[PDB]
């Protein structure tokens, strides 16, 4: 609830608890570079990746105009003007304004076991096509944020999987 009222992102890992604002995350410079279909790259390499185009599936739940009752002001509104209304309880304008902020997932990828990938990391992604004329894919944005990380080790190989997203 504190995270929702402040507009930040929470995750507890490696002995710390983290609150990071969403507006300042959109202006953060990348730290790593991930490329596909490039064998002369100076960074790392992606072996498998998934493109998700379902942006409505996550925006459907946040398409509402918030309203609430305050004993000294009356009815307090916040948000757009052409969306359906929905009632909450806290009549705090700052809390109402941040009620509809989140991160929209876009891409899932599988790499060769990097242990430096933690949520909150910003990466630069470059994807080339492997047929036709080597055209760059413009449907994947340049900078992405890491949302979830899974590391997996069997008796022969070490692999990592990540989910990447963009701030609305």
């Amino acid at each position: 609830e504190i995270a929702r009222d402040t507009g930040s992102m929470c995750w507890a890992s490696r002995g710390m608890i983290n609150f990071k604002s969403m507006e300042k995350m959109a202006n953060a410079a990348p730290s790593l570079t991930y490329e596909s279909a490039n064998p002369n790259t100076s960074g790392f390499t992606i072996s498998q990746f998934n493109i998700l185009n379902a942006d409505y599936e996550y925006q459907r739940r946040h398409n509402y105009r918030m309203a609430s009752y305050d004993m000294t002001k009356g009815v307090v509104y916040s948000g757009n003007q052409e969306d359906p209304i929905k009632f909450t309880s806290n009549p705090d304008p700052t809390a109402l304004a941040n009620y509809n902020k989140f991160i929209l997932p876009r891409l899932d990828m599988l790499v060769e076991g990097n242990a430096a990938l933690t949520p909150g990391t910003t990466l630069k992604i470059v994807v080339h096509n492997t047929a036709g004329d080597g055209e760059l894919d413009e449907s994947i944005p340049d900078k992405m944020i890491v949302m979830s990380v899974t590391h997996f080790e069997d008796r022969f190989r070490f692999v990592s999987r990540a989910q990447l997203g963009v701030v609305n």
């Binding site: 309203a67 004993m71 000294t72 009815v75 209304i85």
Partner: protein, 207 residues
């Protein structure tokens, strides 16, 4: 489906079918609708065979009991609001303004004392009923100043601005172990259909 309570405003009280209903508008959900499409609501009575009128512009709590159906609402009771800068209770019980100032009468046992957040005060349609913590009860007429009740100390006063009427078909007794005082500003009449007896120690008739 709508299950909880909601805040509404009373619109009208002229029921075309005659089954003692009132028209309501929920604040926030029924915004933008013409007054001819708003549904008619029923109320919970306080006792058996009692009817409390509703005036347009009141604030109430509304709930839908028939499986969450919005076509058949139900009114529970009145609601508090402080949107105007002061609460919607009479100012004698809050202390946010100056309230009713009764006229001054010679004699007139002391008016009941009113303190904030400690008295029962109601004021509707020109009638004010007071029941204070000291044990005093008073009913007053706001436009003229007619009052019946007693005081926190336990003294009776019935004051009328205008004519007054006391009558009883049968035996009537008026007793006061004190002095008994009768005074008129015009002409006094004492008429009886039989015998009259004046029994005292000494009698004086002066100019």
């Amino acid at each position: 489906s709508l299950t909880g309570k909601y805040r509404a405003v009373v619109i009208s009280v002229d029921d075309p079918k005659g089954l003692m209903r009132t028209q309501i508008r929920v604040v926030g959900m029924m915004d933008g609708l013409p007054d001819a499409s708003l549904p008619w609501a029923e109320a919970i009575l306080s006792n058996a065979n009692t009817f409390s009128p509703f005036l347009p512009g009141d604030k109430v709590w509304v709930e839908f009991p028939y499986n969450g159906d919005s076509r058949w609402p139900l009114i529970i009771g009145y609601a508090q609001d402080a949107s105007g800068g002061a609460p919607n209770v009479p100012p004698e019980a809050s202390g946010q303004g100056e309230g009713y100032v009764p006229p001054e009468v010679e004699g007139a046992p002391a008016q009941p004392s009113t303190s904030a957040k400690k008295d029962f005060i109601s004021s509707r349609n020109g009638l004010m009923e007071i029941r204070t913590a000291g044990g005093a009860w008073a009913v007053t007429h706001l436009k003229s100043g007619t009052t019946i009740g007693f005081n926190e100390a336990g003294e009776l006063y019935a004051i009328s601005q205008g004519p007054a009427f006391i009558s009883s078909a049968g035996n009537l007794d008026i007793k006061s172990g004190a002095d008994v005082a009768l005074k008129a500003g015009g002409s006094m009449a004492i008429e009886a259909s039989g015998n009259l007896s004046i029994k005292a120690a000494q009698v004086s008739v002066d100019k």
